[PDB]
């Protein structure tokens, strides 16, 4: 097929809501029996957003191995991501336990702790160097080493320490602070500038465990981020970029976690980001600098 031509035909006819509902109708439905067990009721932020049993991340905990998190394993693209909900007050220890156990190097946060007067996620990382956090239930320590604040995103260097063994690991936290719930980024440039910062950090490298991506539910903004990244990888990977079918890729991702991409506009935005990102993939290396300037991260 031809991605760019497809985008124009859908956009000109204003048919995004149509294709999006088709995706919702065609999406996989698998059991989430573990997530629904009463004992895990308080481990879920939302009653309607649960990980499928087949792809859920298991804590190496003998007590209760449940966490609302899913392993999105993209075979052809050769990349895996863990999408999870924003940690709750009682699951912050579980979250970092998962990060440790899965050997993740980066955490991508797409929501804000407070969104329009409502808390979408617990303050699960230290805000100050001198006030480290200790998660007693999972025996982990977390310290803020440094932070680089930009206009619409912040990158933080954290030190995670397994208190049992005393081993320590550097975790990179990429916080997109201006992506509204059920909304889209300011521009493909802002989004791509952020994605490439994550990519360049080395966090998405196959030598590390899967990057952990979350929003409030771990499906809308999270799905948008992963879909774009995966489509860009497939584009760079195969013979013909135009061959990448964004809808087919999204349906594949939905086999691993329900509701990835929550609005038709998020779907539309995904196309925009992949189309613009493809410029860099085909050869234009200068575009990367254009995105950066267009993003106004210095502001």
């Amino acid at each position: 097929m031809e991605m760019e031509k497809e985008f124009e035909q859908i956009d000109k006819s204003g048919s995004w809501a149509a294709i999006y509902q088709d995706i919702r109708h065609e999406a996989s439905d698998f059991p989430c029996r573990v997530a629904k067990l009463p004992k895990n009721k308080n481990r879920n932020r939302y009653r309607d957003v649960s990980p499928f049993d087949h792809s859920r991340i298991k804590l190496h905990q003998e007590d209760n191995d449940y966490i609302n998190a899913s392993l999105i394993k993209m075979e052809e693209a050769q990349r895996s991501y863990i999408l999870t909900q924003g940690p709750l007050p009682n699951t912050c220890g579980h979250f970092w336990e998962m990060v440790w156990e899965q050997k993740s190097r980066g955490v991508v946060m797409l929501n804000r702790v407070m969104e329009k007067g409502s808390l979408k996620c617990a303050q699960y990382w230290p805000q100050k160097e001198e006030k480290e956090m200790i998660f007693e239930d999972t025996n982990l320590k977390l310290t803020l080493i440094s932070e680089d604040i930009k206009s619409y995103y912040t990158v933080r260097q954290l030190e995670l320490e397994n208190l049992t063994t005393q081993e320590t690991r550097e975790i990179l936290h990429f916080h997109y602070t201006t992506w509204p719930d059920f909304g889209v980024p300011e521009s493909p440039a802002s989004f791509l500038n952020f994605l490439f910062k994550v990519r360049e950090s080395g966090s998405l490298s196959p030598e590390h465990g899967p990057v952990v991506v979350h929003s409030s539910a771990g499906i809308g903004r999270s799905g948008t981020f992963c879909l774009a990244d995966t489509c860009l990888l497939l584009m760079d990977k195969r013979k013909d970029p135009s061959s990448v079918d964004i809808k087919k890729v999204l349906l594949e991702m939905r086999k691993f976690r329900m509701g990835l991409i929550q609005t038709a506009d998020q779907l539309r935005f995904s196309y925009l980001a992949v189309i613009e990102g493809a410029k860099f993939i085909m050869g234009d290396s200068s575009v990367q600098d254009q995105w950066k300037e267009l993003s106004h991260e210095d502001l």
């Binding site: 932020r45 939302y46 009653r47 309607d48 957003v49 409502s118 059920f182 409030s216 539910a217 509701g259």
Partner: peptide, 7 residues
């Protein structure tokens, strides 16, 4: 607040 999906 308990439900995230918008009808």
């Amino acid at each position: 607040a308990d439900f995230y999906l918008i009808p």
